[PDB]
Enzyme design. Structure first.
Site, PDB file in Angstrom:
ATOM      1  CG  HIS A   1      -1.973   1.113   1.159  1.00 39.54           C
ATOM      2  ND1 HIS A   1      -1.861   2.252   0.380  1.00 39.54           N
ATOM      3  CD2 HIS A   1      -3.185   1.190   1.759  1.00 39.54           C
ATOM      4  CE1 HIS A   1      -2.971   2.972   0.493  1.00 39.54           C
ATOM      5  NE2 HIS A   1      -3.767   2.369   1.358  1.00 39.54           N
TER       6      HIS A   1
ATOM      7  CG  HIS B   1      -5.317   6.119  -0.801  1.00 39.51           C
ATOM      8  ND1 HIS B   1      -5.582   4.767  -0.858  1.00 39.51           N
ATOM      9  CD2 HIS B   1      -5.855   6.654  -1.925  1.00 39.51           C
ATOM     10  CE1 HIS B   1      -6.280   4.500  -1.949  1.00 39.51           C
ATOM     11  NE2 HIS B   1      -6.467   5.630  -2.611  1.00 39.51           N
TER      12      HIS B   1
ATOM     13  CE1 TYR C   1      -4.186   6.277   5.861  1.00 41.40           C
ATOM     14  CE2 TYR C   1      -4.642   5.353   3.707  1.00 41.40           C
ATOM     15  CZ  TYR C   1      -5.086   5.873   4.902  1.00 41.40           C
ATOM     16  OH  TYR C   1      -6.461   5.977   5.099  1.00 41.40           O
TER      17      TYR C   1
HETATM   18  C1  LIG Z   1     -14.659   2.165   2.433  1.00 40.59           C
HETATM   19  C2  LIG Z   1     -13.372   2.184   1.648  1.00 40.59           C
HETATM   20  C3  LIG Z   1     -12.237   1.574   2.170  1.00 40.59           C
HETATM   21  C4  LIG Z   1     -11.038   1.566   1.437  1.00 40.59           C
HETATM   22  N1  LIG Z   1      -9.891   0.992   1.958  1.00 40.59           N
HETATM   23  C5  LIG Z   1      -8.737   0.953   1.170  1.00 40.59           C
HETATM   24  C6  LIG Z   1      -7.593   0.289   1.594  1.00 40.59           C
HETATM   25  O1  LIG Z   1      -7.603  -0.296   2.684  1.00 40.59           O
HETATM   26  N2  LIG Z   1      -6.461   0.304   0.817  1.00 40.59           N
HETATM   27  C7  LIG Z   1      -6.421   0.954  -0.405  1.00 40.59           C
HETATM   28  O2  LIG Z   1      -5.366   0.957  -1.086  1.00 40.59           O
HETATM   29  N3  LIG Z   1      -7.554   1.598  -0.833  1.00 40.59           N
HETATM   30  C8  LIG Z   1      -8.714   1.587  -0.075  1.00 40.59           C
HETATM   31  N4  LIG Z   1      -9.842   2.247  -0.559  1.00 40.59           N
HETATM   32  C9  LIG Z   1      -9.838   2.863  -1.926  1.00 40.59           C
HETATM   33  C10 LIG Z   1     -10.389   1.840  -2.920  1.00 40.59           C
HETATM   34  O3  LIG Z   1      -9.484   0.751  -3.047  1.00 40.59           O
HETATM   35  C11 LIG Z   1     -10.586   2.357  -4.353  1.00 40.59           C
HETATM   36  O4  LIG Z   1      -9.308   2.698  -4.840  1.00 40.59           O
HETATM   37  C12 LIG Z   1     -11.530   3.556  -4.400  1.00 40.59           C
HETATM   38  O5  LIG Z   1     -12.763   3.224  -3.764  1.00 40.59           O
HETATM   39  C13 LIG Z   1     -11.791   4.094  -5.826  1.00 40.59           C
HETATM   40  O6  LIG Z   1     -12.324   3.078  -6.643  1.00 40.59           O
HETATM   41  P1  LIG Z   1     -13.908   2.982  -6.912  1.00 40.59           P
HETATM   42  O7  LIG Z   1     -14.282   4.255  -7.633  1.00 40.59           O
HETATM   43  O8  LIG Z   1     -14.088   1.760  -7.777  1.00 40.59           O
HETATM   44  O9  LIG Z   1     -14.649   2.861  -5.610  1.00 40.59           O
HETATM   45  C14 LIG Z   1     -11.015   2.188   0.162  1.00 40.59           C
HETATM   46  C15 LIG Z   1     -12.139   2.813  -0.310  1.00 40.59           C
HETATM   47  C16 LIG Z   1     -13.334   2.785   0.406  1.00 40.59           C
HETATM   48  C17 LIG Z   1     -14.542   3.473  -0.200  1.00 40.59           C
END
Ligand SMILES: Cc1cc2nc3c(=O)[nH]c(=O)nc-3n(C[C@H](O)[C@H](O)[C@H](O)COP(=O)(O)O)c2cc1C
Ligand SMILES: NC(=O)C1=CN([C@@H]2O[C@H](COP(=O)(O)OP(=O)(O)OC[C@H]3O[C@@H](n4cnc5c(N)ncnc54)[C@H](OP(=O)(O)O)[C@@H]3O)[C@@H](O)[C@H]2O)CCC1
EC number: 1.3.1.42
Length: 364
Positions: A176, A179, A181
């Site tokens: 990871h 974002h 982190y």
């Molecule tokens: C509730 C939630 C939890 C997430 N947790 C992670 C995570 O633990 N690690 C990560 O790399 N991205 C995490 N994300 C980001 C998602 O992996 C994804 O990149 C993001 O939702 C955009 O894609 P989408 O438009 O298909 O939802 C999370 C997103 C959401 C909404």
């Protein structure tokens, strides 16, 4: 439908290109994987389909959300093994995402209420608030900027967690690095104000992610390692003055790790802001893909149609879906059939109930 053409992700022969994006859901009470996780991943698993788990702790100090799973204890490994077995019984491939939040934490989440660690002593600004275990929102504290010995110790935490993931039966791990982190806190020049060999130049800011990736590649093999970055997401004050160049510098270091390893990574996984400056967001995505010698997963606001177009035009090899997968356990089949999709409820994204808003979204 090019989303349903097979793809060789190294040793892993995938039957379709729809990927479960990693998502934190906070059901792993006391950082221990629970049976509810096994039901949730099993619901989403398909034969030949690729799943990436929610971010998983690499150390007692690596968390900034409540009830997220770890993979640094043998107890966690034992419980993960039960989930992996269930997912492998459906014929899916599953990687564990290794996650350290760095400065995006709080005393309530740290052992002995200690300060979170980072590249920097600068806290996340007050524009962002951290979700607390009681559902309120709190203030991100001042982190402690770590020295290079402690950097080598965190790298070892990634290495041990990667080995633990393999022991649990995971097919691989994802780093990871997105974002805002811990890894992104070294990458972005909006955060990394260091004056040692981990800060300043592009090369110095890419040192941390390079060392993490080299450590896990050396432990478990490059073909079991994926890397996720988000050069153009500014979440938690994580901005760079030149996102495309930062992204291209990361890709160059991955290409070199591959040449020196003699082997390809599982993939590079790039994620972008969901609500998209569209054609320019596309610029960044295609430029990173074109730069990178290997498998590319695109992510962030993709729809059925945009995923098809992405694979059809050669823009990506795999497409990951996050929010739609929350509310559509059978999203793969829905995409195959062009079946209508279920809405998701943000209010239960990070709640603790093992069923409600987790496994009770209906199949088609
Ligand atoms: C509730 C939630 C939890 C997430 N947790 C992670 C995570 O633990 N690690 C990560 O790399 N991205 C995490 N994300 C980001 C998602 O992996 C994804 O990149 C993001 O939702 C955009 O894609 P989408 O438009 O298909 O939802 C999370 C997103 C959401 C909404
Ligand atoms: N829990 C997490 O670690 C993450 C949750 N995130 C959620 O991913 C989704 C996409 O993030 P975004 O900033 O691209 O949101 P969008 O409103 O689609 O633009 C949102 O639900 C967001 O809250 C992103 C940041 C990290």
């Amino acid at each position: 439908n090019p989303l349903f053409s097979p793809y060789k992700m190294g040793k892993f022969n995938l039957s379709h290109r729809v990927v479960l994006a990693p998502m934190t859901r906070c059901r792993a009470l006391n950082n221990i994987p629970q049976a509810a996780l096994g039901e949730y991943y099993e619901q989403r698993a398909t034969a030949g389909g690729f799943l990436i788990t929610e971010g998983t702790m690499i150390s007692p100090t690596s968390a900034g959300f409540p009830h997220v799973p770890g993979i640094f204890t043998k107890e966690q490994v034992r419980e993960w093994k039960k989930i992996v077995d269930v997912v492998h019984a459906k014929g899916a491939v599953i990687f564990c995402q290794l996650w350290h939040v760095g400065r995006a934490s709080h005393e309530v989440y740290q052992p002995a209420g200690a300060a979170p660690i980072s590249s920097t002593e600068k806290p996340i600004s007050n524009r962002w608030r951290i979700l607390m275990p009681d559902g309120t929102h709190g203030i991100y504290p001042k982190p402690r900027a770590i020295g290079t010995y402690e950097i080598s110790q965190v790298v070892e935490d990634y290495r041990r967690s990667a080995l633990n993931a393999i022991e649990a039966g995971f097919d691989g791990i994802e780093i990871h690095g997105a974002h805002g982190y811990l890894i992104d806190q070294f990458l972005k020049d909006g955060i990394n104000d260091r004056t040692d060999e981990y800060g300043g130049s592009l090369a110095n800011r890419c040192k941390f992610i390079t060392q993490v990736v080299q450590a896990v590649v050396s432990a478990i093999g490059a073909d079991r390692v994926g890397v996720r970055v988000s050069p153009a997401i500014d979440h938690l004050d994580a901005m760079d003055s030149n996102p495309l160049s930062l992204g291209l510098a990361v890709v160059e270091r991955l290409n070199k790790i591959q040449l020196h390893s003699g082997s390809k990574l599982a993939y590079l996984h790039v994620t972008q802001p969901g609500d998209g400056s569209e054609e320019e967001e596309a610029r960044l995505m295609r430029t990173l893909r074109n730069a990178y010698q290997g498998t590319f997963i695109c992510s962030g606001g993709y729809t059925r149609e945009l995923g098809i177009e992405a694979v059809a035009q050669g823009d990506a090899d795999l497409v990951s879906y996050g929010r739609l997968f929350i509310s559509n356990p059978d999203l793969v089949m829905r995409i195959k059939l062009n079946a209508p999709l279920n809405k998701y409820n943000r209010k239960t994204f990070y709640t603790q109930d093992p069923v409600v808003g987790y496994t009770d979204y209906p199949f088609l």
